Amino acid sequence: AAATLTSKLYSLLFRRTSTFALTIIVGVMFFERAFDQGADAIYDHINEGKLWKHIKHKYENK
Amino acid sequence: VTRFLGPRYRELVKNWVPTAYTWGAVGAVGLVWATDWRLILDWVPYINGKFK
Amino acid sequence: AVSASGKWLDGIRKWYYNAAGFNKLGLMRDDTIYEDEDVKEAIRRLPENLYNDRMFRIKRALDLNLKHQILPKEQWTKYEEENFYLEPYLKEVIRERKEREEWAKK
Amino acid sequence: TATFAQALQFVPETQVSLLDNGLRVASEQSSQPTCTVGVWIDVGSRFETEKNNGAGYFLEHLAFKGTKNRPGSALEKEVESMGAHLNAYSTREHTAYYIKALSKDLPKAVELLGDIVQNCSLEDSQIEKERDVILREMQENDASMRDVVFNYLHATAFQGTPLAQAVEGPSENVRKLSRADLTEYLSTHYKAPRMVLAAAGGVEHQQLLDLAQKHLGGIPWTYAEDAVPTLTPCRFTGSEIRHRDDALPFAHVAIAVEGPGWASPDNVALQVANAIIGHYDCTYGGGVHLSSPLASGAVANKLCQSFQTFSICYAETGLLGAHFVCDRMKIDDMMFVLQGQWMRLCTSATESEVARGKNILRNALVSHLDGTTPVCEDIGRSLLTYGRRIPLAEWESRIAEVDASVVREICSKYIYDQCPAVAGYGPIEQLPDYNRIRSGMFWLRF
Amino acid sequence: PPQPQDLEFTKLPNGLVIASLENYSPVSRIGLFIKAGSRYEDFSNLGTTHLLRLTSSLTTKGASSFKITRGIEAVGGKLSVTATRENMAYTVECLRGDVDILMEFLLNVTTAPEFRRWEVADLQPQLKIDKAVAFQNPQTHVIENLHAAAYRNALANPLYCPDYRIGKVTSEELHYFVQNHFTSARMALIGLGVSHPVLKQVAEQFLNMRGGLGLSGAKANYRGGEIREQNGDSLVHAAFVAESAVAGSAEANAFSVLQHVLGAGPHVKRGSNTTSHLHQAVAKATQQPFDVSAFNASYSDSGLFGIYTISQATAAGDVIKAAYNQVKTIAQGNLSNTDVQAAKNKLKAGYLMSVESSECFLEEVGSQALVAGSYMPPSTVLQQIDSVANADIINAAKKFVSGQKSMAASGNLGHTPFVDEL
Amino acid sequence: SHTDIKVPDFSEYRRLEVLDSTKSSRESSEAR
Ligand SMILES: CCCCCCCCCCCCCCCCC[C@@H](O)O[C@H](CO[C@H](O)CCCCCCCCCCCCCCC)COP(=O)(O)OCC[N+](C)(C)C
């Protein structure tokens, strides 16, 4: 229960809605990058060795 | 227009200036994010990785 | 003061007045002014007799315009008989607005 | 000839002096031929429980019904043959008995006062008479609407706290009290050093101190079994109470947010803000698009009948808000304008409004103190609230420190994005739901 | 601080009385007292005064309505218009440093009023609101009926506009009343924080205004009629007045002592007035809630002494009989000495306690200046009040008993007596 | 008689930080 952490977040970035919107924009930018990278890694893991990315090395520059 | 002048209308602008800057910043970042503008984005420490 | 220029000014103003057709319909000058909020309040301050006269003359003008007719020559409004009945009221209302705006800025 | 702050220095000061038992004696002398002597006690409904909720109010009814030395009608006969006026009042945090009389009768007044606070006879037949009297007076209070909505506001804003219950107490409680709970309440609370004697007007401090020792010096200061009635803080709750009765003429909303205790500097600035909003009525002259912003808009569609802003302060906590009446069909519009005015103060406050607020505050402070009785009340309430009597010069100095920026920060500290407490008693079908009221405490543009 | 100052009086050749005092309070107060009142209207114009006192905020030739309110509001001061059948009192309060500003408005409003007809028309509906609020309390309706029941012409005029005149008051009537009743000789000016010499020159401006004397009224004649109302309220009100002495006379003091002997005013809160003779007489007559006391209204032309009794509809007759019988016993000569002293002490305490407040003190000074122009210190009041003898009070009681009575009673009236049978 | 009204207990709905009728709510409002 990081009550102090939530208190700091509110007092600095939520009391005014202008700051509230700005945090949202930066958060989504970072979130999409992390979400996309993690999801693609999971997809590649489940399908290891079948995607063309995993076999192109056997023909590219070859 | 002449009525808009006066000591207080200047004060009202001063109070709202911080809010105007923040809203302008919100719009600028939103535009860059929506458009995936590589020119500015290439100087972002982590987001730049997306670009290959 | 200038006499010849003043008489020329009076003559050209009379010519312009005759060029404007509202005298042809029995309308006074103050009836044609655009009715903004200031004019609306000014009309609200008119005495009953002037207000009643103003409404009837407007009705007659609208009725004449309905049938594309013109009032007889003898009944046209004359440049020298006109009374600016609405001027004092409109001036007072405008001055009050200026005072309010001047206070509002400081 | 004299400037404002220069005239403030000609006001006489108050002389304080303790007795052995711990009683505080204060006095402000003048050339007037009259005086007001009273005792203030730091006892109220805040110190009571469910079993003795109405004890303070009940005792007030028996205060002047007779005493051991002057039984029955002897007490009022002496008071009235003197031409004086005997009065009392109660609250959730204070009680007071004060007499207005001529300086020539200062001695006797104190004697009686001491007799009333030490030797209060509690004959049982009198208790029965007061039972019915309080029962009827409670019915009258129901007729008053403002009292009803202000008690509701306390009940909902201090849920589960001793500050929630009213001074009078439940009707069921007043019909079961006995001469044993009243004596326990009297013995446990009415004693020095909680008492504060005050005397403003043509009275000399020296005389006021010898007389007090003669009579008030006998009050005990030791609790039995060390059963000390300790005070505790009070929690504030953001909630609403809606009592609907469409037969009543007008809606009667009341809103308030939590506010500082009486002993914080910020309250002064808040008072200035309350002066900007101001009060309105239907009998005031002019003002239609000619007075403060909330009252100018109050007559454009004929929204309100009368609204007032209040700031109730208790120890460690208080209430800050605005009370308004309105027609059935215009409830939401009046609330909309009021919330806009509060938010405007939090964000856009000009110095011209502040200067008007400061001037209004100075007038209220100076004009209120006119007369002896208001002066004596201020001495007693201050000595039990701050422990001192803030002089006018200090008040002016603190007010001068107020600035538009200061008001913005303080109002943002207490008004912005805070959960309010709402009370409505009347035709209140149009009152907006709490969620809408709570969403109107901030701005999406800010 | 300096020594206690005194009040300076002066009378300009116009006839205006100017009085000033120099205290050291930080708040200053100015007042204008005019002999104009509701008694100076005739049947042609009525309700004029009631509308006139609402026009204090209207525009003037030298200042706009917008300016007056905004200027006063910004300074933080106030302006009020107290009114009565005999007099009208303008009053203004502010700080020491702003006096010169506010006086400019006060002078203007009473010297150069410009009763714009459209402004008057828009202000007309306010009359109903004011009238309704006052009548919310039934005591207002009972007295205004009482004055209309005991006087034929002059003091019968109501303080509030009659219903039928609400929409028909004109600016010409306002103008006509002002010219004929705002004369300088009829006026007086009082100041508390201001210095006397500056008061002279600020007042010098209107010496070119008004002047001479105004339109005199008519001596109020006494009739003795009744005015019953028969409303649906459960608690009946009444009134039993008779001719009294004139304001500011030796006989008037005896009547003042008489009412306080009869328990006119309550002193102790939540307590029965045992010393009051009327409450004792009624307590053994009714066992339900009741309220009783004496009435005293002294005017320049005449006065009226009487009794007011709130009581239940069923017990109205008994209450009135007990009160009236009590007065007869007093008139018969049964009056103890102790009651005289107790009543006198009540009077002196009331007088000094009332004047204690600065606002009331300014009101008392203005009222005295108009009629006489010479302030009479409270000590002189005490010597006058102590000269009253028992025989004087007995004579006062006998006069009230023998005199003709006027009665106004609102309520159910199912059991209330009539005059000629009381 | 209106003094006989009192709010029923909400203890089963209140949040943890406001469950005590003695602790002030100002120290948790910003956190909540
Ligand atoms: C285009 C197609 C869109 C389709 C959308 C489909 C959506 C389907 C799912 C629906 C989900 C519904 C819920 C979504 C929002 C949930 C939260 C919302 O209801 O809350 C409100 C949301 O309100 C907003 O948050 C208010 C601030 C406005 C923020 C705007 C952010 C815009 C970001 C994107 C900008 C893009 C710019 C692009 C420029 C080119 C009010 O929040 P509140 O807690 O009561 O506000 C308190 C304000 N404080 C914090 C300051 C005290």
CSV table of N, CA and C in Angstrom, one decimal, chain C residues 11-105:
chain,number,residue,atom,x,y,z
C,11,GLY,N,-27.0,71.5,-48.8
C,11,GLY,CA,-27.6,71.1,-50.0
C,11,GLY,C,-27.4,69.7,-50.4
C,12,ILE,N,-26.1,69.2,-50.2
C,12,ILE,CA,-25.8,67.8,-50.6
C,12,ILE,C,-26.5,66.9,-49.6
C,13,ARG,N,-26.6,67.2,-48.3
C,13,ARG,CA,-27.3,66.4,-47.4
C,13,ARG,C,-28.8,66.3,-47.7
C,14,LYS,N,-29.4,67.4,-48.1
C,14,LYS,CA,-30.8,67.4,-48.6
C,14,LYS,C,-30.9,66.5,-49.8
C,15,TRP,N,-30.0,66.6,-50.8
C,15,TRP,CA,-30.0,65.8,-51.9
C,15,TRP,C,-29.9,64.3,-51.6
C,16,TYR,N,-29.0,64.0,-50.7
C,16,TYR,CA,-28.9,62.6,-50.2
C,16,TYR,C,-30.2,62.1,-49.5
C,17,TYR,N,-30.8,63.0,-48.7
C,17,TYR,CA,-32.0,62.6,-48.0
C,17,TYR,C,-33.1,62.3,-49.0
C,18,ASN,N,-33.2,63.1,-50.1
C,18,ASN,CA,-34.2,62.9,-51.1
C,18,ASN,C,-33.9,61.6,-51.9
C,19,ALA,N,-32.6,61.3,-52.1
C,19,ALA,CA,-32.2,60.1,-52.8
C,19,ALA,C,-32.6,58.9,-52.0
C,20,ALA,N,-32.5,58.9,-50.7
C,20,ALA,CA,-33.0,57.8,-49.9
C,20,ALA,C,-34.5,57.8,-49.9
C,21,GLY,N,-35.1,56.6,-50.2
C,21,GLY,CA,-36.5,56.5,-50.4
C,21,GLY,C,-37.4,56.4,-49.2
C,22,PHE,N,-36.9,56.4,-48.0
C,22,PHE,CA,-37.8,56.2,-46.9
C,22,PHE,C,-38.7,57.4,-46.7
C,23,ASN,N,-38.4,58.6,-47.1
C,23,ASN,CA,-39.3,59.7,-47.0
C,23,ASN,C,-40.5,59.4,-47.9
C,24,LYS,N,-40.4,58.6,-49.0
C,24,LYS,CA,-41.5,58.3,-49.9
C,24,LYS,C,-42.5,57.4,-49.2
C,25,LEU,N,-42.2,56.8,-48.0
C,25,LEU,CA,-43.1,55.9,-47.3
C,25,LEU,C,-43.6,56.6,-46.0
C,26,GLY,N,-43.3,57.8,-45.8
C,26,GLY,CA,-43.7,58.5,-44.5
C,26,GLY,C,-42.8,58.1,-43.3
C,27,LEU,N,-41.7,57.4,-43.6
C,27,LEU,CA,-40.9,57.0,-42.5
C,27,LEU,C,-40.0,58.2,-42.1
C,28,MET,N,-39.8,58.3,-40.8
C,28,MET,CA,-38.7,59.2,-40.2
C,28,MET,C,-37.4,58.5,-40.3
C,29,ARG,N,-36.3,59.3,-40.1
C,29,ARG,CA,-35.0,58.8,-40.1
C,29,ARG,C,-34.7,57.8,-39.0
C,30,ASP,N,-35.2,58.0,-37.8
C,30,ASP,CA,-34.9,57.2,-36.7
C,30,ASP,C,-35.6,55.8,-36.8
C,31,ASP,N,-36.5,55.6,-37.7
C,31,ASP,CA,-37.2,54.3,-37.9
C,31,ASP,C,-36.4,53.3,-38.6
C,32,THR,N,-35.4,53.8,-39.4
C,32,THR,CA,-34.7,52.9,-40.3
C,32,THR,C,-33.4,52.3,-39.6
C,33,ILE,N,-33.1,52.8,-38.4
C,33,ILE,CA,-31.9,52.3,-37.8
C,33,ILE,C,-32.0,50.8,-37.4
C,34,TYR,N,-30.9,50.1,-37.6
C,34,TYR,CA,-30.9,48.7,-37.3
C,34,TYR,C,-31.1,48.5,-35.8
C,35,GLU,N,-31.9,47.5,-35.4
C,35,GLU,CA,-32.4,47.3,-34.1
C,35,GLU,C,-31.5,46.3,-33.4
C,36,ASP,N,-30.4,46.9,-32.8
C,36,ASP,CA,-29.6,46.1,-31.9
C,36,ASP,C,-30.0,46.2,-30.4
C,37,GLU,N,-29.4,45.5,-29.5
C,37,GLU,CA,-29.9,45.5,-28.1
C,37,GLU,C,-29.9,46.9,-27.6
C,38,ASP,N,-29.0,47.7,-27.9
C,38,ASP,CA,-29.1,49.1,-27.5
C,38,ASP,C,-30.3,49.8,-28.0
C,39,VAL,N,-30.6,49.6,-29.3
C,39,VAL,CA,-31.8,50.2,-29.8
C,39,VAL,C,-33.1,49.6,-29.2
C,40,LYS,N,-33.0,48.3,-28.9
C,40,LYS,CA,-34.2,47.7,-28.2
C,40,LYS,C,-34.5,48.3,-26.9
C,41,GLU,N,-33.5,48.5,-26.1
C,41,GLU,CA,-33.7,49.2,-24.8
C,41,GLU,C,-34.2,50.6,-25.0
C,42,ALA,N,-33.6,51.3,-26.0
C,42,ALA,CA,-34.0,52.7,-26.2
C,42,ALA,C,-35.5,52.8,-26.6
C,43,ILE,N,-36.0,51.9,-27.4
C,43,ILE,CA,-37.4,51.8,-27.8
C,43,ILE,C,-38.2,51.5,-26.5
C,44,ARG,N,-37.7,50.7,-25.7
C,44,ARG,CA,-38.5,50.3,-24.5
C,44,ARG,C,-38.7,51.5,-23.6
C,45,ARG,N,-37.8,52.6,-23.7
C,45,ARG,CA,-37.9,53.8,-22.9
C,45,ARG,C,-38.8,54.9,-23.5
C,46,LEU,N,-39.3,54.6,-24.7
C,46,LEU,CA,-40.1,55.7,-25.4
C,46,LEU,C,-41.4,55.8,-24.7
C,47,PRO,N,-42.0,57.1,-24.7
C,47,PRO,CA,-43.4,57.2,-24.2
C,47,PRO,C,-44.4,56.6,-25.2
C,48,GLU,N,-45.5,56.3,-24.6
C,48,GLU,CA,-46.5,55.5,-25.4
C,48,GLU,C,-46.9,56.1,-26.7
C,49,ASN,N,-47.0,57.4,-26.8
C,49,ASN,CA,-47.5,58.1,-28.0
C,49,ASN,C,-46.5,57.9,-29.1
C,50,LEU,N,-45.2,58.2,-28.8
C,50,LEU,CA,-44.2,58.0,-29.8
C,50,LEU,C,-44.0,56.6,-30.2
C,51,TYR,N,-44.1,55.7,-29.3
C,51,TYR,CA,-44.0,54.2,-29.6
C,51,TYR,C,-45.2,53.8,-30.5
C,52,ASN,N,-46.4,54.3,-30.2
C,52,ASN,CA,-47.6,54.0,-31.0
C,52,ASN,C,-47.4,54.5,-32.4
C,53,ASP,N,-47.0,55.8,-32.5
C,53,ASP,CA,-46.8,56.4,-33.8
C,53,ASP,C,-45.7,55.6,-34.6
C,54,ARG,N,-44.6,55.2,-34.0
C,54,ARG,CA,-43.6,54.5,-34.7
C,54,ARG,C,-44.1,53.2,-35.2
C,55,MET,N,-44.9,52.4,-34.5
C,55,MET,CA,-45.4,51.1,-34.9
C,55,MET,C,-46.3,51.3,-36.1
C,56,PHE,N,-47.2,52.3,-36.1
C,56,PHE,CA,-48.2,52.5,-37.2
C,56,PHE,C,-47.5,52.8,-38.5
C,57,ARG,N,-46.5,53.7,-38.4
C,57,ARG,CA,-45.8,54.1,-39.6
C,57,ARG,C,-45.0,53.0,-40.2
C,58,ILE,N,-44.5,52.1,-39.3
C,58,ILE,CA,-43.8,50.9,-39.8
C,58,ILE,C,-44.8,50.0,-40.5
C,59,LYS,N,-46.0,49.8,-39.9
C,59,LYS,CA,-47.0,49.0,-40.6
C,59,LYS,C,-47.4,49.5,-41.9
C,60,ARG,N,-47.6,50.9,-42.0
C,60,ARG,CA,-47.9,51.5,-43.3
C,60,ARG,C,-46.8,51.2,-44.4
C,61,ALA,N,-45.6,51.4,-43.9
C,61,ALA,CA,-44.5,51.2,-44.9
C,61,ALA,C,-44.4,49.7,-45.3
C,62,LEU,N,-44.6,48.8,-44.4
C,62,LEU,CA,-44.6,47.4,-44.8
C,62,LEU,C,-45.8,47.1,-45.7
C,63,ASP,N,-46.9,47.7,-45.4
C,63,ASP,CA,-48.1,47.5,-46.3
C,63,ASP,C,-47.9,48.0,-47.7
C,64,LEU,N,-47.3,49.2,-47.8
C,64,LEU,CA,-47.0,49.8,-49.1
C,64,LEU,C,-46.0,48.9,-49.9
C,65,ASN,N,-44.9,48.5,-49.2
C,65,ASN,CA,-43.9,47.6,-49.8
C,65,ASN,C,-44.6,46.3,-50.3
C,66,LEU,N,-45.6,45.9,-49.6
C,66,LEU,CA,-46.3,44.7,-50.0
C,66,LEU,C,-46.8,44.7,-51.5
C,67,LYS,N,-47.4,45.8,-51.8
C,67,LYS,CA,-48.0,46.0,-53.2
C,67,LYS,C,-47.2,46.9,-54.1
C,68,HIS,N,-45.9,47.1,-53.7
C,68,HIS,CA,-45.0,47.9,-54.6
C,68,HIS,C,-45.6,49.3,-55.0
C,69,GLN,N,-46.3,49.9,-54.0
C,69,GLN,CA,-46.9,51.2,-54.2
C,69,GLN,C,-46.0,52.3,-53.5
C,70,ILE,N,-46.4,53.5,-53.8
C,70,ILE,CA,-45.7,54.7,-53.2
C,70,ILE,C,-46.7,55.7,-52.7
C,71,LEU,N,-46.4,56.3,-51.5
C,71,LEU,CA,-47.3,57.2,-50.9
C,71,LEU,C,-47.3,58.5,-51.8
C,72,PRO,N,-48.5,59.2,-51.8
C,72,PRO,CA,-48.6,60.4,-52.7
C,72,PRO,C,-47.6,61.4,-52.4
C,73,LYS,N,-47.2,62.2,-53.4
C,73,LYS,CA,-46.2,63.2,-53.3
C,73,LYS,C,-46.4,64.1,-52.1
C,74,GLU,N,-47.7,64.6,-51.9
C,74,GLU,CA,-47.9,65.6,-50.8
C,74,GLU,C,-47.7,65.0,-49.4
C,75,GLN,N,-47.7,63.7,-49.3
C,75,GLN,CA,-47.5,63.1,-48.0
C,75,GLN,C,-46.1,62.6,-47.7
C,76,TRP,N,-45.2,62.8,-48.6
C,76,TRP,CA,-43.8,62.5,-48.4
C,76,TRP,C,-43.2,63.3,-47.2
C,77,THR,N,-42.3,62.7,-46.5
C,77,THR,CA,-41.7,63.3,-45.4
C,77,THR,C,-40.7,64.4,-45.9
C,78,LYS,N,-40.6,65.5,-45.2
C,78,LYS,CA,-39.8,66.7,-45.6
C,78,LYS,C,-38.6,66.8,-44.8
C,79,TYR,N,-37.5,67.3,-45.4
C,79,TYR,CA,-36.2,67.3,-44.8
C,79,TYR,C,-36.1,68.1,-43.6
C,80,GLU,N,-36.9,69.2,-43.5
C,80,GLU,CA,-36.8,70.2,-42.4
C,80,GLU,C,-37.8,69.9,-41.3
C,81,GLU,N,-38.9,69.1,-41.5
C,81,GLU,CA,-39.8,68.8,-40.5
C,81,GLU,C,-39.5,67.6,-39.6
C,82,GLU,N,-38.5,66.9,-40.0
C,82,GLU,CA,-38.1,65.7,-39.2
C,82,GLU,C,-37.7,66.0,-37.8
C,83,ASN,N,-38.1,65.1,-36.9
C,83,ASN,CA,-37.7,65.2,-35.5
C,83,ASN,C,-36.9,64.0,-35.1
C,84,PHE,N,-35.7,64.2,-34.6
C,84,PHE,CA,-34.9,63.0,-34.1
C,84,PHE,C,-35.3,62.7,-32.7
C,85,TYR,N,-36.5,62.1,-32.6
C,85,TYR,CA,-37.0,61.7,-31.3
C,85,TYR,C,-36.2,60.7,-30.6
C,86,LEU,N,-35.6,59.8,-31.3
C,86,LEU,CA,-34.9,58.7,-30.6
C,86,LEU,C,-33.5,59.0,-30.3
C,87,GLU,N,-32.9,60.1,-30.7
C,87,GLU,CA,-31.5,60.4,-30.5
C,87,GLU,C,-31.2,60.5,-29.0
C,88,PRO,N,-31.9,61.3,-28.2
C,88,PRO,CA,-31.5,61.4,-26.8
C,88,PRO,C,-31.5,60.1,-26.0
C,89,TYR,N,-32.5,59.2,-26.2
C,89,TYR,CA,-32.5,57.9,-25.5
C,89,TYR,C,-31.4,57.0,-25.9
C,90,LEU,N,-31.1,56.9,-27.3
C,90,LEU,CA,-30.0,56.1,-27.7
C,90,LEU,C,-28.7,56.6,-27.2
C,91,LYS,N,-28.5,57.9,-27.2
C,91,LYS,CA,-27.2,58.4,-26.7
C,91,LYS,C,-27.0,58.0,-25.2
C,92,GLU,N,-28.0,58.2,-24.4
C,92,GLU,CA,-27.9,57.8,-23.0
C,92,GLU,C,-27.6,56.4,-22.8
C,93,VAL,N,-28.2,55.5,-23.5
C,93,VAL,CA,-28.0,54.1,-23.4
C,93,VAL,C,-26.5,53.7,-23.8
C,94,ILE,N,-26.1,54.3,-24.9
C,94,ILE,CA,-24.7,54.1,-25.3
C,94,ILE,C,-23.7,54.5,-24.3
C,95,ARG,N,-23.9,55.7,-23.7
C,95,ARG,CA,-23.0,56.3,-22.7
C,95,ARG,C,-22.9,55.3,-21.5
C,96,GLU,N,-24.1,54.8,-21.1
C,96,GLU,CA,-24.1,53.9,-20.0
C,96,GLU,C,-23.3,52.6,-20.3
C,97,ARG,N,-23.4,52.1,-21.5
C,97,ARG,CA,-22.6,50.9,-21.8
C,97,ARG,C,-21.1,51.2,-21.8
C,98,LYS,N,-20.7,52.4,-22.3
C,98,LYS,CA,-19.3,52.8,-22.2
C,98,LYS,C,-18.8,52.9,-20.8
C,99,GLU,N,-19.6,53.5,-19.9
C,99,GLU,CA,-19.2,53.5,-18.5
C,99,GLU,C,-19.1,52.2,-17.9
C,100,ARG,N,-20.0,51.2,-18.2
C,100,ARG,CA,-19.9,49.9,-17.6
C,100,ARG,C,-18.6,49.2,-18.2
C,101,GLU,N,-18.3,49.3,-19.4
C,101,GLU,CA,-17.1,48.7,-20.0
C,101,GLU,C,-15.9,49.4,-19.4
C,102,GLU,N,-15.8,50.7,-19.2
C,102,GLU,CA,-14.7,51.3,-18.6
C,102,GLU,C,-14.4,50.8,-17.2
C,103,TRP,N,-15.5,50.7,-16.4
C,103,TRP,CA,-15.3,50.2,-15.1
C,103,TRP,C,-14.8,48.7,-15.1
C,104,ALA,N,-15.3,47.9,-16.1
C,104,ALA,CA,-15.1,46.5,-16.1
C,104,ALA,C,-13.6,46.2,-16.3
C,105,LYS,N,-12.9,47.1,-16.9
C,105,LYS,CA,-11.5,46.8,-17.3
C,105,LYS,C,-10.5,47.1,-16.1
